[PDB]
């Protein structure tokens, strides 16, 4: 009965500075990998003994993924700024938590896809992995778009695939 | 391993 989570957060800075982006990974509630844009050389880093038996290609790949994520967060913070009719001088946070609960068998017990804005829940994937709960109307807009684009299918491609397999590869290492 | 980029909000 194991689990894997990622918490990717960004906090926008007033002025022309890029947001502060972090990515934290957990296997069975234990932090195993971490990224921080404030680092002198922003890379994904192993936070656990068994993680550093991974090749350099792994680290490079996921680091690039982190870069792309920085882009996503900077764009969508703007989007949310728009939705909520907020002054552009403020500071704001956006968080993406996602992952998978895999049973004793090795099967996907549960999938997680959740987004929060300024501490408050924004939108989340329901247990059936095909429905969304939307906090407010701003969230209702996102729910509409994502329902037309079939976002749940897309996220499910990860949740039902790489999440489980990578979780297992990570358990082997323990 | 990290997930692919989410859809825009």
């Amino acid at each position, epitope marked *: 009965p194991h689990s894997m989570r990622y918490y990717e957060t960004a906090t926008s800075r007033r002025g022309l500075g890029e947001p502060r982006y972090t990515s934290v990974g957990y296997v069975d509630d234990k932090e195993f990998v971490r990224f921080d844009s404030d680092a002198e050389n922003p890379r994904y880093e192993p936070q656990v003994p068994w993680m550093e038996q991974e090749g350099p290609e792994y680290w490079e790949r996921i680091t690039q*993924i982190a870069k792309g994520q920085e*882009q996503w967060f900077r764009v969508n913070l703007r989007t949310l700024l728009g939705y909520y009719n907020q002054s552009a001088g403020g500071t704001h946070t956006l968080q993406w938590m996602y992952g998978c609960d895999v049973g004793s068998d090795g099967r996907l017990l549960r999938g997680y896809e959740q987004f929060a804005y300024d501490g408050c829940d924004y939108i989340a994937l329901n247990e059936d992995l095909r429905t969304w709960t939307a906090a407010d109307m701003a969230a209702q807009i996102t729910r509409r*778009k994502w329902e037309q684009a079939g976002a749940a299918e*897309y996220y*499910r491609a990860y949740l039902e695939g790489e999440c489980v397999e990578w979780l297992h590869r990570y358990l082997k290492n323990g | 391993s990290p997930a692919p980029r989410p*859809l*825009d909000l």
Partner: T-cell receptor
Amino acid sequence: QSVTQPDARVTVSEGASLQLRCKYSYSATPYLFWYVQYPRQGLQMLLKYYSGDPVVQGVNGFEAEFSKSDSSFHLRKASVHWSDSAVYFCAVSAKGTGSKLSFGKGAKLTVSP
Amino acid sequence: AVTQSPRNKVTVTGGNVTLSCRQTNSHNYMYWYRQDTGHGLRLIHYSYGAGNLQIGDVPDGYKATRTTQEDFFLLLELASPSQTSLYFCASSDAPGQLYFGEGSKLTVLE
């Protein structure tokens, strides 16, 4: 990285069954798409597949099927309408780069009446 | 709702052409493709958000600018005959799901 449609041009009879073939070559499972282009127009998304049930069923009578073993995403219609005459593009995007579509060279469909 | 201009354009080798694309969707992804017989659609440049540029498959001889969320320009400083083609613009808000313009037909003469 490649997307292959074998037949550049296909002629079928009206009411007859149509299959447009598409094999992709990608290292991991990509996201799969069919686009249609009627004369003097841009491309329009016909079908999409991200995950799950391999058979994606369009409301227009079309349906495409993701086959992992065969590395295919063939398009099908049990009975073509004359208004189905168009150019059909198979398209895939890599798993890490889902926003970068690579297209097949297309299949021009002629529905002879 | 994608709009391209000009829809038709004829220049000569060495000429300077600018294709304009505007989308009133709130899409952050925009693309410039070219279509030729026996080549299907080939990506030249694309963009995610205002100010962001990204190299496509056939970027050579092409420059691009994304001034705002809505505007994507394809720039051609030294028009070659090889650049005679049908240029499509597209916008997206979901991976792989593109909304196309009606096309800009460009002919380059010697």
